[PDB]
Design an enzyme around this catalytic site. Sequence first.
Site, PDB file in Angstrom:
ATOM      1  N   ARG A 102     -11.578  -2.391   7.421  1.00  0.00           N
ATOM      2  CA  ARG A 102     -10.308  -2.182   6.739  1.00  0.00           C
ATOM      3  C   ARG A 102      -9.129  -2.297   7.690  1.00  0.00           C
ATOM      4  NH1 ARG A 102     -12.208   2.995   8.091  1.00  0.00           N
ATOM      5  NH2 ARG A 102     -10.491   4.028   9.230  1.00  0.00           N
ATOM      6  N   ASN A 103      -9.366  -2.168   8.998  1.00  0.00           N
ATOM      7  CA  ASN A 103      -8.325  -2.339  10.002  1.00  0.00           C
ATOM      8  C   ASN A 103      -8.302  -3.735  10.623  1.00  0.00           C
ATOM      9  OD1 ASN A 103      -7.100   0.261   9.905  1.00  0.00           O
ATOM     10  ND2 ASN A 103      -8.858   1.095  11.058  1.00  0.00           N
ATOM     11  N   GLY A 153       0.821  -1.185   0.000  1.00  0.00           N
ATOM     12  CA  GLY A 153       0.000   0.000   0.000  1.00  0.00           C
ATOM     13  C   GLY A 153       0.859   1.240   0.000  1.00  0.00           C
ATOM     14  N   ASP A 184     -10.537   3.464  16.170  1.00  0.00           N
ATOM     15  CA  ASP A 184     -10.685   3.352  14.727  1.00  0.00           C
ATOM     16  C   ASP A 184     -10.941   1.899  14.313  1.00  0.00           C
ATOM     17  OD1 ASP A 184      -8.677   4.432  11.810  1.00  0.00           O
ATOM     18  OD2 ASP A 184     -10.706   3.610  11.980  1.00  0.00           O
ATOM     19  N   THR A 230       4.671   4.166   3.079  1.00  0.00           N
ATOM     20  CA  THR A 230       4.529   3.010   2.204  1.00  0.00           C
ATOM     21  C   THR A 230       4.694   1.723   3.003  1.00  0.00           C
ATOM     22  OG1 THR A 230       6.629   3.883   1.352  1.00  0.00           O
ATOM     23  CG2 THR A 230       4.856   3.498  -0.207  1.00  0.00           C
ATOM     24  N   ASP A 245      -4.041  -1.272  13.210  1.00  0.00           N
ATOM     25  CA  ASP A 245      -4.123   0.192  13.130  1.00  0.00           C
ATOM     26  C   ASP A 245      -4.326   0.926  14.447  1.00  0.00           C
ATOM     27  OD1 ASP A 245      -3.805   2.184  10.885  1.00  0.00           O
ATOM     28  OD2 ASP A 245      -5.652   2.948  11.742  1.00  0.00           O
ATOM     29  N   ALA A 285       0.347   8.808   1.041  1.00  0.00           N
ATOM     30  CA  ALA A 285       1.176   9.989   1.217  1.00  0.00           C
ATOM     31  C   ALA A 285       1.840   9.891   2.583  1.00  0.00           C
ATOM     32  CB  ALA A 285       0.339  11.265   1.097  1.00  0.00           C
ATOM     33  N   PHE A 286       3.148  10.086   2.619  1.00  0.00           N
ATOM     34  CA  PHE A 286       3.880  10.068   3.874  1.00  0.00           C
ATOM     35  C   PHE A 286       4.117   8.656   4.414  1.00  0.00           C
ATOM     36  CE2 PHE A 286       3.452  14.381   3.374  1.00  0.00           C
ATOM     37  CZ  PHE A 286       3.834  15.143   4.458  1.00  0.00           C
TER      38      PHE A 286
HETATM   39  C1  LIG Z   1      -7.261  -3.387   2.455  1.00  0.00           C
HETATM   40  C2  LIG Z   1      -5.815  -2.916   2.549  1.00  0.00           C
HETATM   41  C3  LIG Z   1      -4.912  -4.067   2.992  1.00  0.00           C
HETATM   42  O1  LIG Z   1      -4.852  -4.347   4.185  1.00  0.00           O
HETATM   43  N1  LIG Z   1      -4.250  -4.675   1.981  1.00  0.00           N
HETATM   44  C4  LIG Z   1      -3.370  -5.687   2.136  1.00  0.00           C
HETATM   45  C5  LIG Z   1      -2.860  -6.105   3.370  1.00  0.00           C
HETATM   46  C6  LIG Z   1      -1.936  -7.140   3.444  1.00  0.00           C
HETATM   47  N2  LIG Z   1      -1.386  -7.642   4.565  1.00  0.00           N
HETATM   48  C7  LIG Z   1      -0.836  -6.865   5.512  1.00  0.00           C
HETATM   49  N3  LIG Z   1      -0.172  -7.461   6.534  1.00  0.00           N
HETATM   50  C8  LIG Z   1       0.402  -6.688   7.556  1.00  0.00           C
HETATM   51  C9  LIG Z   1       0.285  -5.299   7.490  1.00  0.00           C
HETATM   52 CL1  LIG Z   1       1.002  -4.307   8.772  1.00  0.00          CL
HETATM   53  C10 LIG Z   1      -0.399  -4.729   6.415  1.00  0.00           C
HETATM   54  N4  LIG Z   1      -0.474  -3.388   6.415  1.00  0.00           N
HETATM   55  C11 LIG Z   1      -1.010  -2.722   5.386  1.00  0.00           C
HETATM   56  C12 LIG Z   1      -1.011  -3.181   4.065  1.00  0.00           C
HETATM   57  C13 LIG Z   1      -1.597  -2.450   3.039  1.00  0.00           C
HETATM   58  C14 LIG Z   1      -2.162  -1.218   3.338  1.00  0.00           C
HETATM   59  C15 LIG Z   1      -2.150  -0.756   4.641  1.00  0.00           C
HETATM   60  C16 LIG Z   1      -1.569  -1.483   5.669  1.00  0.00           C
HETATM   61  S1  LIG Z   1      -1.673  -0.751   7.243  1.00  0.00           S
HETATM   62  O2  LIG Z   1      -3.017  -1.126   7.893  1.00  0.00           O
HETATM   63  O3  LIG Z   1      -1.551   0.760   7.019  1.00  0.00           O
HETATM   64  C17 LIG Z   1      -0.238  -1.129   8.490  1.00  0.00           C
HETATM   65  C18 LIG Z   1      -0.558  -0.600   9.915  1.00  0.00           C
HETATM   66  C19 LIG Z   1       0.955  -0.404   7.887  1.00  0.00           C
HETATM   67  N5  LIG Z   1      -0.934  -5.526   5.473  1.00  0.00           N
HETATM   68  C20 LIG Z   1      -1.547  -7.773   2.283  1.00  0.00           C
HETATM   69  O4  LIG Z   1      -0.662  -8.794   2.437  1.00  0.00           O
HETATM   70  C21 LIG Z   1      -0.474  -9.495   1.208  1.00  0.00           C
HETATM   71  C22 LIG Z   1      -2.032  -7.375   1.058  1.00  0.00           C
HETATM   72  C23 LIG Z   1      -2.944  -6.336   0.967  1.00  0.00           C
HETATM   73  N6  LIG Z   1      -3.355  -5.991  -0.268  1.00  0.00           N
HETATM   74  C24 LIG Z   1      -3.246  -4.563  -0.708  1.00  0.00           C
HETATM   75  C25 LIG Z   1      -4.275  -4.215  -1.742  1.00  0.00           C
HETATM   76  N7  LIG Z   1      -4.161  -5.184  -2.840  1.00  0.00           N
HETATM   77  C26 LIG Z   1      -4.899  -4.641  -4.000  1.00  0.00           C
HETATM   78  C27 LIG Z   1      -4.411  -3.223  -4.354  1.00  0.00           C
HETATM   79  C28 LIG Z   1      -4.647  -6.510  -2.369  1.00  0.00           C
HETATM   80  C29 LIG Z   1      -3.766  -7.056  -1.237  1.00  0.00           C
HETATM   81 CL   LIG Z   2      -0.164   3.678   4.114  1.00  0.00          CL
END
Ligand SMILES: */C=C\C(=O)Nc1cc(Nc2ncc(Cl)c(Nc3ccccc3S(=O)(=O)C(C)C)n2)c(OC)cc1N1CCN(CC)CC1
Ligand SMILES: [Cl-]
Length: 317
Positions: free
Chosen positions: A145-146, A23, A141, A29, A159, A26-27
Amino acid sequence: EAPNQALLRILKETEFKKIKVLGSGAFGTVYKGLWIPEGEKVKIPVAIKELREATSPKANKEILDEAYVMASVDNPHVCRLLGICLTSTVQLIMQLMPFGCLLDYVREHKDNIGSQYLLNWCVQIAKGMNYLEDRRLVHRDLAARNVLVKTPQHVKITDFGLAKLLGAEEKKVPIKWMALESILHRIYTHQSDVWSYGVTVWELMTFGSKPYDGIPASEISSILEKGERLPQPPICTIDVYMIMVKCWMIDADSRPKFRELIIEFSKMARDPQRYLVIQGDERMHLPSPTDSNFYRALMDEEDMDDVVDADEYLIPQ
Ligand SMILES: */C=C\C(=O)Nc1cc(Nc2ncc(Cl)c(Nc3ccccc3S(=O)(=O)C(C)C)n2)c(OC)cc1N1CCN(CC)CC1
Ligand SMILES: [Cl-]
Ligand SMILES: [Cl-]
Ligand SMILES: [Cl-]
Ligand SMILES: [Cl-]
């Protein structure tokens, strides 16, 4: 209050490699990645949340607050923080949830999601929330999505950037997930979270629809004061919908405790068909591969023989 003896672990950036962006904000990744502890001989699938900018002190202060909280929790339905890396910007290294957003998940797989799965996610999320209440932690929150998905069988909450202590009065807003008392008075409580929990249960029962869709957020405070709530989902028995509605009471003390929500849904998950009506509930399979083959393609790497999930990587190191 009690002294917080959580350990904060500091990792060398050499110990882990980024693999793919999950993901971009802004600010910030978020990277899918691999981490090899030092002298450990294990490989740990991780997500790496990094700040593109130098401070951004407020942003910088918010990421360290998030690490502080996440380091201070231990529960099967709360997300683990593995450590931080003190590079040019600060990075959070957390357990990777391979199936993504629960939100993304329900929409992507809505035609293959049965009643047992929905009812149990409800049970788990409540358990995580109850754990956070136990620790006097207010999430502020909760939303679908979280909630992240480790396996279809196992979700965990996440989150914690906004997470505050109860009564802290600490120094966008989701609005649609927010208790009326939070919208009018900036008041937040475990029972405020219980409301957001109800909206989350709604999001899952509708396979990911937007609450109060096509309604401007500015309007919402008047709507909720008038007495309007979210509609009853189609798959939804009155019993389940009646649970949601109690989360959305004006008097937050009349709302159910997370303690209670575990019990109620747990009973419903004993006879899942009686509380949720899903066309073709039976021929529904949701696939969790645990094979060494499975991790690739993701992090295709080559040989994953030494993978250990975060939940199996325990310390004292
Ligand atoms: C619906 C967004 C999402 O959660 N996508 C996502 C998440 C994961 N798995 C994963 N495992 C651990 C963490 Cl810390 C995160 N964090 C994360 C990932 C993506 C966006 C935001 C965060 S976060 O909640 O800000 C964190 C506190 C930094 N994610 C994953 O593992 C394969 C894959 C996805 N996606 C992203 C969207 N993609 C289509 C564009 C499908 C799979
Ligand atoms: Cl982010
Ligand atoms: Cl490496
Ligand atoms: Cl090493
Ligand atoms: Cl851990």
